């Protein structure tokens with residue numbers, strides 16, 4: 440699975 444963190 441691809442991940443994205445929008446800190």
Ligand SMILES: [Zn+2]
Pocket residue numbers: 440441442
């Ligand atoms: Zn993954």
